RNA sequence: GCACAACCUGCGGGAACCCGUACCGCAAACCGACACAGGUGGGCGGGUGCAAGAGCACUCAGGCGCGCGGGAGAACCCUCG
RNA sequence: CAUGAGUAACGAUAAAGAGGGUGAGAAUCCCUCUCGCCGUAAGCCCAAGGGUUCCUACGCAAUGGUCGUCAGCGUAGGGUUAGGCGGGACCUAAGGUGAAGCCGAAAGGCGUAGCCGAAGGGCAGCCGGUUAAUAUUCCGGCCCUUCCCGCAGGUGCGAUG
RNA sequence: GAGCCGGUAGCGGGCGUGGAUCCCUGGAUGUCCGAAUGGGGGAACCCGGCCGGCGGGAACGCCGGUCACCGCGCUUUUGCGCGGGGGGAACCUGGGGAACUGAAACAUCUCAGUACCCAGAGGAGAGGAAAGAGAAAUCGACUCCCUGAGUAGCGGCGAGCGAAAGGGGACCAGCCUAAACCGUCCGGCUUGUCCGGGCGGGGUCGUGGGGCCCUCGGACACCGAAUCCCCAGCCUAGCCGAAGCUGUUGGGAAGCAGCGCCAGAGAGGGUGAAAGCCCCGUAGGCGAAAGGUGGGGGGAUAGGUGAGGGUACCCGAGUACCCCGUGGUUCGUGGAGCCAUGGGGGAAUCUGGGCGGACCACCGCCUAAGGCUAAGUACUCCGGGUGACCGAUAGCGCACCAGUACCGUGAGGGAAAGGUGAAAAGAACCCCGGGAGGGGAGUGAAAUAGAGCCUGAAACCGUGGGCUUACAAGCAGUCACGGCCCCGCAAGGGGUUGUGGCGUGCCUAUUGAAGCAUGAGCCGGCGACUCACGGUCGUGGGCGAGCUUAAGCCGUUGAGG
């Protein structure tokens, strides 16, 4: 929780919470870690707008706050990230490896 | 548009001249929109001006690296 | 440095009449010599700079929370056609 | 230097920018820490009457009615007969 | 946070009464009608100094020494433009500065000259009309101002000593 | 490394893994003011003269490049080409320089060369190779620390004030120029043989230097940046990086419990209540760059140093020195020395001349009246870190739109206000109402957590209930008892009082107070016998000879030696 940070986009778990149930991580931010799990929200029962339905109470609510999510699931759910070895002319690949694996590679899934 | 850098790296003398001046222009043409398109437009300005900006780094680069 | 332009039309109402027959006013870089506006004016709409006029004002009575301001500088530079033409599109406009 | 292109003088042509006005402003907006009856510069100061007159009394225009109200109205200070 | 105190006090003894109106509510806003006090001022006017505000539109919980649907109050928007008005684009006194110069332990003291420096000098317009709002600044009628290019006519013209 | 369009989140639109946000180093215009300097001027705004440009050309007017002053050296003609100036919290040098208070008065004296006005070099200057010390046939730059005695001493010898060599320590380069003599030379005057100024050898370190005669002499030394190349220390971006889940009481768990885990890294904070194994690029260790800075280690660059006697001498300051008029200094007038200067006098080249002892005779000392700088103590703007250092009236006053509000003419003075909650889910919607604001619904773990909204007490005002009160004289009260009402099993315990007994309120300064002497408006938070040494007496503790400053050194803990 710094100007560094966790997974992104990403896919993961949650341990003290209320849902564990983890899942797609719509936005975070570099600082505070602020990030949306898509995982409780609420309504806002909006403005009363016809900004909302003129009838509102806005639906998709969901800030993500805690930061007691296990971040990245390989085979493996729960566990640190890595670093590198390279192995590759310029080979940064921070990716996460431990136990099972993964790197959120460009390719069939973020 | 890095690209635009590029341009740049490409005119000279009176080209950079009435290339920024025209350019600038234009940005002018935005100033006459504060009040119409506008929505989209934002850009045009923020970026035109950064474009034009850019233009004179330019200028001051080439005819510096004159005299 | 040189870029012409220095200037925002006067979307003000009364001002309108004069944008109406033969005369138009703008807000202009407080600063720009009168001739200045002459010539701005001359190059910028292709016209026939007549009478050039100027005032100018400040902002007064702007509260702010727990602190407070006015504004800054707005410049007033009134023109007129010789003929009536150009800006067109601008007056049909506003 | 001028004096052949300097100045005096007509007509034509063409020029002329910088900062300024709003309104208050013998005064609740200027000065007394207050919508404080204090002070603060020059412009006839309309009219009738009075010997004369910016004083006098009523007024011209023009300006008000002071900004907390109603109430009976005895002590007594005030103001005045 | 109490207390005399819900008494003392409302800023001038230049008085006000009505009708209708608008309003959630109008002694305390708007019209209009009776009425008193100014008038030589409670006139208008330039200037100073204030620097918002002025207007037009909404609003009043704060503010006016209660009111208050009123405001110079709050919110927003628009509002003053001049070759000839003024001041500089010029003149200068007192007077400040100050190249020189005389002078202090230092910082300065004194200071011609040239300069800065005034509703004291000097200079070319006025009136009638138009905006919520500004005017001899805008419009219009009428009257000019110098400086530049020229040309036309005219001359020892030509400093600022 | 994958998200950003600063604090605004909202509107309305976006850029970006063909390194976007952003961290750093060097880039570009870089408005007008401010040393300002082209001129003026109430700064932050009005004027002007030169070449370029554009426009309606000339007049106008903008971008522009443009044009003080100073002294400073150069081609006297470039007046071309430099310098400075303008700052800066504290430290710093010199310039000039004060009352209080003490001396329980106070004129010598005192605070003190302190406060303050100034000028100025810095990043630190200051001082800095001896006409020194000191008396031993001794030392050896300067500066700062401990010690040297608070003795030696200065003095209405009174208040008081108060050294210096040495020793312990730290830090240890030393280097130079006119100094006529050399010759060289150009100018000289005026010519021969004087002066003037350039090159030098000489360019004194603890004493020679020069000129004549002879012995001479044929590779180790670097600066105070001489100087250059580097590992350039950092600057700010870097990187990794140790091990748990199941359960479980909970709105929560990181907690109780179960078993499994790390550790050259149990420093800490952060993740809805207290984790080594969850967040943290930390302690673990390592990391890294082509710019901006150098001591080291080494090189090279190395100016310039680095011999012997002989001989008539000429060769570091214009004033030493002595009279009085004065400064220093532990010295205040004195037997009063040395350095230092304001007046008048007014010279010596190493048999020279001040210095030890006022002075005289001695020995001894040092070598003056020029020059340069490093290194060790100071200082704190700014950065980092640690705190038997502070918690919102203490802390900087100042914890965040406080050096701003606001008073003063200016000079100048100089507040307050920190927290809703775990996260915004902070309040659709219905209902009295002009509005505020008020009842509901939803929030939620709570909303007596609801926006000035945590914990949220005293003071004061309020709504209801208990006892009590209209023949009463009293700070108060309070001992007694009787009537109420209360918990009560009774014992009885509560609160409430009518009858009666006896009762001058507290602080300060008083022979002396009820005060009519005083302080006292009520609540709340602040609110005053310390610290450093000297000592001094005690007494708790180590040896009798007992104890250790300044330092050098090891030092998460930094461990003490």
Not at chain 2, 27 to 44: D, V
């Amino acid at each position: 929780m710094r100007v560094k940070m966790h997974v992104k986009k990403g896919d993961t778990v949650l341990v003290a919470s209320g849902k564990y149930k983890g899942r797609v991580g719509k936005v975070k931010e570099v600082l505070p870690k602020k990030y949306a799990v898509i995982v409780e929200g609420v309504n806002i029962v909006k403005k009363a707008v016809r900004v909302s339905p003129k009838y509102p109470q806005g639906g998709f609510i969901e800030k993500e706050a805690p930061l007691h999510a296990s971040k990245v699931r390989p085979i493996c759910p729960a566990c640190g990230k890595p670093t590198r070895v390279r192995k590759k002319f310029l080979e940064n690949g921070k990716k996460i490896r431990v136990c099972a694996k993964c790197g959120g590679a460009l390719d069939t899934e973020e | 548009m890095r690209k635009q850098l590029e341009e740049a790296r490409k005119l000279s003398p009176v080209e950079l001249e009435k290339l920024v001046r025209e350019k600038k222009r234009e940005l002018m043409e935005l100033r006459f929109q504060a009040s119409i398109g506008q929505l989209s437009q934002n850009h045009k300005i923020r970026d035109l001006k950064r474009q034009i900006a850019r233009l004179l780094t330019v200028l001051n680069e080439k005819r510096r690296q004159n005299a | 440095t040189a870029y012409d332009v220095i200037l925002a039309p006067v979307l003000s109402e009364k001002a309108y009449a004069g944008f109406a027959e033969g005369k138009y006013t703008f807000w202009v870089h407080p600063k720009a010599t009168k001739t200045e506006i002459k010539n701005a004016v001359e190059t910028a709409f292709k016209v026939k700079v007549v009478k050039v006029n100027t005032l100018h004002v400040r902002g007064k009575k702007k509260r702010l929370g727990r602190y407070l301001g006015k504004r800054p500088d707005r410049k007033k530079a009134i023109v007129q056609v010789a003929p009536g033409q150009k800006i067109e599109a601008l007056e049909g406009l506003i």
